[PDB]
Amino acid sequence: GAMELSMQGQLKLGCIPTIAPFLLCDLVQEINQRFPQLNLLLREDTTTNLLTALRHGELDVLILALPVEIDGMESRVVGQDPFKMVISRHQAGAIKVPIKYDDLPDESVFLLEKGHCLTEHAVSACKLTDKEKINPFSATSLHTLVQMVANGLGTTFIPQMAIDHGLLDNQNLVVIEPPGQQAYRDIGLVWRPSSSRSKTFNQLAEVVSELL
């Protein structure tokens, strides 16, 4: 017979569509080795929906792009994710580098629908002020946004973690620096102040910071 006897057990973690496919792959491989009793149940959803789920106790912690509205929550910024622009190789001649937005055709910049925080972060961080350059057809996923660029329709802003995880592979794209010397987004963890699991969240924050 036998005698019966913080990074242990189950965690429900939410993450946005422009981070989850990329960073969470690395996070899972790291915690598999370093914290092998931690089981991560994962939710992918856009920022507003994740915040509601967090406030309602349906998720324990979020990995978000910041800043976004997170009134009343605890957060910790864990790193920075640079922005690049991308263009198809077959349109790369028709656009000169360094990029000056004023020299692009009108309606040449494709962006995600506004429910995705990537658009607000990229437009402000990369200083796109001329709305006439934005194409009126809004993209609805990062993959189909890139595919439209790969089809030659224009340009867009892409996070570095997507490039590092192969999003552009076999799509014959060229990666360009955007305007601005603050062309990145912050990445952070967000949780409830009343949570008893702060020690767990801060250990996870350290792991995530090492992946950025």
* CA 113 to chain centroid: 15
Name which of 1 and 136 has its Cβ closer to a second copy. 136
- 3-state SS, residue 61: strand
10 Å CB burial of residue 7 (0-12, 13-18, 19+) is middle
Q: Which of 27, 35, 47, 84 binds Cl ion (CB under 5 A)?
A: 47
- Site membership for a second copy, residue 150 (CB under 8 A): yes
Q: Report the nearest approach of a second copy to the CB of residue 142 (Å).
A: 9
Residue the block writes with tokens 């867009």:
156
Give the contact letters, 88-127, x = binds to a second copy (CB under 8 A), - = no: x-x-------------------------------------
Reported as type and span, the H/E element at residue 165 is none
Residue 92 CB contacts under 8 Å (≥ 6 apart), including other chains: 174
Residue 160 CB contacts under 8 Å (≥ 6 apart), including other chains: 81, 82, 83, 84, 184
Amino acid at 99: I
Residue 212 touches which member of Cl ion, a second copy, none, C-beta under 5-8 Å by kind: none
Q: Report the nearest approach of a second copy to the CB of residue 133 (Å).
A: 17
- Site membership for a second copy, residue 39 (CB under 8 A): yes
Using the Cα atoms of residue 66, residue 67, residue 71 and residue 72 in order, give the sign of their dihedral: positive
Q: Report the nearest approach of Cl ion to the CB of residue 50 (Å).
A: 8
Piece of 12-20, 51-59, 151-159, 186-194 that binds Cl ion (CB under 5 A)? 12-20
Six-digit token pair at 176? 């360009």
Q: Which of 8, 28, 103, 105 binds a second copy (CB under 8 A)?
A: 28
Reported as type and span, the H/E element at residue 141 is none
Give the contact letters, 100-129, x = binds to Cl ion (CB under 5 A), - = no: ----------------xx------------
Reported as type and span, the H/E element at residue 50 is helix 47-55
Give contact residues for a second copy (rule: CB under 8 A). 12, 15, 17, 20-21, 24-25, 28-29, 31-32, 39-45, 88, 90, 137, 139-141, 143-144, 147-148, 150-153, 166, 169-172
